Amino acid sequence: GSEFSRHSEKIAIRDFQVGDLVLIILDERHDNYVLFTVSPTLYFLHSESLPALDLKPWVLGKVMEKEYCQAKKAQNRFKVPLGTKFYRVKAVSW
């Protein structure tokens, strides 16, 4: 996209697509950074991406990849019930 448009970008809050600008926040309940969303579905920030956003165990980021996942153990990194479906998002700096 054009340079002007790249500057005038707005924050996606649902139906996240590769290239979207997103707001990333810590979700203490789920022990992870998440994308701010008005959707009921959880979009976790992939562990691989925390350093890219100057995070260490809010920020703005750009979605690079997304993966649809299901929790297969009741005790899991995401503190969700067994069988919960959610996304993991890789993001880069804006």
Binding site: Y68, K73, R77, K85
Partner: peptide, 9 residues
Amino acid sequence: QDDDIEVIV
């Protein structure tokens, strides 16, 4: 490390 989850496609 991706043992508590499975990617669904």
